[PDB]
Structures are given as structure tokens and as C-alpha cells.
Design a protein around this nucleic acid. Structure first.
Length: 70
DNA sequence: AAACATTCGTTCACGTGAGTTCCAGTACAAGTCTGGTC
């Protein structure tokens, strides 16, 4: 689950553990935020979202199911 | 005028429906143990 306020991002797991270190707390750093920051529309500054985090292979353009690996 | 049959209000036993308490079956939620990898 992702919390967004302006340029500030925060991520939480199923049981409540912080994961912002991995996914980035600002567009300058991270593994997802620098690329998803510009996806949001002009009028949206505060947001809470819930979803799944997955691994994507661009070569085959396919989701790699995280059975137990990668 | 006397004897026998019938009828009536009473009595007991037995059966059936509704209320109450107790326990078993069911459901759901949380806890505990386990598995696999990166």
C-alpha cells in the first residue's frame, strides 16, 4: 500500500512493515518511484493506493510469477 | 307390588400440545506449527 503527499511517498506491507527504503521515498531514489512519479494526473497530490508488487520481464513483456524466486 | 334394564353425573387412566432447561452440532476467528526461496 502506497501513501503519497506531494513529493513524499511511503510504502507499507501486509503486516505493516515499512518498505520505503526499497521502493523510494522521493523521485530522486528508489526502484519504482522515479518512474511512477509522473504517471499521476495534475490535480492529484494526496493519494492512498492498495495493490500488488510484481516482477516484470520486458524482453518477453510478461509478469514473472514470484513462486519463490527472483 | 317387586325385579330388571337404562341413564346420568362421577371417577380414573392414558394420550397429546406448549413452555422451560440443558447439551451437542455448527460457524467463525485467532493462535500455533510448518514450508519454500531470496
Amino acid at each position: 500500500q502506497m501513501h503519497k503527499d506531494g513529493d513524499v511517498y511511503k510504502y507499507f506491507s501486509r503486516n505493516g512493515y515499512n518498505y520505503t527504503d526499497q521502493f523510494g521515498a522521493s523521485p530522486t531514489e528508489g526502484s519504482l518511484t522515479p518512474f511512477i512519479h509522473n504517471a499521476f494526473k495534475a490535480d492529484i497530490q494526496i493519494c492512498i493506493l492498495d495493490g500488488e508488487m510484481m516482477a516484470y520481464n520486458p524482453n518477453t513483456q510478461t509478469f514473472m510469477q514470484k513462486g519463490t524466486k527472483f
